[PDB]
């Protein structure tokens, strides 16, 4: 029954992974003990995608929790829903990665990886028909970045015919001052380009700017940043968790969204944007929903969608609304904004509508775009990487772990190639 295995690695991966489970649990009527208490049958129809049914009619997330930082286990277990997670699915080390990709990928991470693979093997074999995997992690640290990409690679060896999907948090010096974050992110992107089928680019630069400029928060905290992350993750997974026709599984989503294998980095967006504690006085109209979710101020990646073209788009509308009005509005943005949509992929914008809205909203909309403007995110990381790399800055922290400088050169070149490929398709014409 199309099961997904969820994996959360590192401090960021576990923080956003926990919020994902707290949020989707509420939507499905599942309390922290695993009991169901809802009104709608749509809540449990596809509960199997993310939850295992344990004895006593309980539901337990098909989630594996990983971190080299031992202290992460306590913070996850102490969360509102820490009780729901399978105890044996918590795999924690004693020595962290110290913001070092090489430690997470090659040394401390490699020491712990077989313990994680044992637990993913067990969840995977228990599946009636496994779809693939979903990894939440950051790219700026050491565990989520290095060990997360090591896990992806090992999982790909045993399950090569399954979808590998990630929620990858991109670093921004606006939220983190760690000097080596561009190194860790470039090394991770190199891995993601080769080994994932679809990746959602949750950019800390866009999240900080949404909180500061749009939500008017003088100093956004990780809670503020993560409110946007969970709201995004709920929206982008709605099609997988509820009964529907379009993009109902990770494979059908990838066939619709990815025309060229490497070009699988999605720009997520949502509407209405809200802060924690902001009440909704009235529901947005379908034209407000459609206009806002396509707005650059609503994107979760710091890229201007009007600086590129949309290869493909998935629009998900949640709540009770007119489908005729939705269709009209979706045709309206494409006909009015025709120059930001590739003309050589006919009917590249697919729209789904789910009757169940998210918490505190009567109407909402989530956007998923595969845009050539995503090169703005990669160019920003590449520039930061190059500034340090030309000075051979901080390399001993990586080569001291056994790494070769040639790996940095290879990763830089691969990400720069990815950027040229987006530009090639942006300039392509339907001759």
């Amino acid at each position: 029954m199309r099961e997904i295995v969820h994996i959360q690695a590192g401090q960021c991966g576990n923080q956003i992974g926990a919020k994902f489970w707290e949020v989707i649990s509420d939507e499905h009527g599942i309390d922290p003990t695993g009991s169901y208490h809802g009104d709608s049958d749509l809540q449990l129809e596809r509960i199997n995608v993310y939850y295992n049914e344990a004895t006593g009619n309980k539901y337990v997330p098909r989630a594996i929790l990983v971190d080299l930082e031992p202290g992460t286990m306590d913070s996850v277990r102490s969360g509102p829903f820490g009780q729901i997670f399978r105890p044996d699915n918590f795999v924690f080390g004693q020595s962290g990665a110290g913001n070092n990709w090489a430690k997470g990928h090659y040394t401390e991470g490699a020491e712990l990886v077989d313990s994680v693979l044992d637990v993913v093997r067990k969840e995977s074999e228990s599946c009636d028909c496994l779809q693939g995997f979903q990894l939440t992690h950051s790219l700026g640290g050491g565990t989520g970045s290095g060990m997360g990409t090591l896990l992806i690679s090992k999982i790909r060896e045993e399950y090569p015919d399954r979808i590998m999907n990630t929620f990858s948090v991109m670093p921004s010096p606006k939220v983190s001052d760690t000097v080596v974050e561009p190194y860790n992110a470039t090394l991770s992107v190199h891995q993601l380009v080769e080994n994932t089928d679809e990746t959602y680019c949750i950019d800390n630069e866009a999240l900080y700017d949404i909180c500061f400029r749009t939500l008017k928060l003088t100093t956004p905290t990780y809670g503020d940043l993560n409110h946007l992350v969970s709201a995004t993750m709920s929206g982008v997974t709605t099609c997988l968790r509820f009964p529907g026709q379009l993009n109902a599984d990770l494979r059908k989503l990838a066939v619709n969204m990815v025309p060229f294998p490497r070009l699988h980095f999605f720009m997520p967006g949502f509407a209405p944007l809200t802060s924690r504690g902001s009440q909704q006085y009235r529901a947005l109209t379908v034209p407000e929903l459609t206009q806002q979710m396509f707005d650059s101020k609503n994107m979760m990646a710091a890229c201007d969608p009007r600086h590129g073209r949309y290869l493909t788009v998935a629009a998900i509308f949640r709540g009770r609304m007119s489908m005729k009005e939705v269709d009209e509005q979706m045709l309206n943005v494409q006909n009015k904004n025709s120059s930001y949509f590739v003309e050589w992929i006919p009917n590249n914008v697919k729209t789904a509508v789910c009757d169940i809205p998210p918490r505190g909203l009567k109407m909402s909309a989530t956007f998923i775009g595969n845009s050539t403007a995503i090169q703005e995110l990669f160019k920003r990381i590449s520039e930061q990487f190059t500034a340090m790399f030309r000075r051979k800055a901080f390399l001993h922290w990586y080569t001291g772990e056994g790494m070769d400088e040639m790996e940095f050169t290879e990763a830089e070149s691969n990400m720069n190639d990815l950027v040229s490929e987006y530009q090639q398709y942006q300039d392509a014409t339907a001759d």
Partner: protein, 40 residues
């Protein structure tokens, strides 16, 4: 910056807790047969 620190009296022999000097770090960051005919 290494230069201005040195002109302001920075100790070049100063070792960190890993037993490394500043120049040891920059070096760490930076990354045959010879036929000799002999008369007898």
């Amino acid at each position: 910056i290494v230069e201005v620190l040195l002109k302001y009296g920075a100790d070049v022999n100063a070792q960190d807790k890993f037993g490394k000097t500043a120049f040891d770090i920059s070096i760490d960051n930076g990354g045959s047969v010879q036929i000799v005919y002999k008369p007898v």
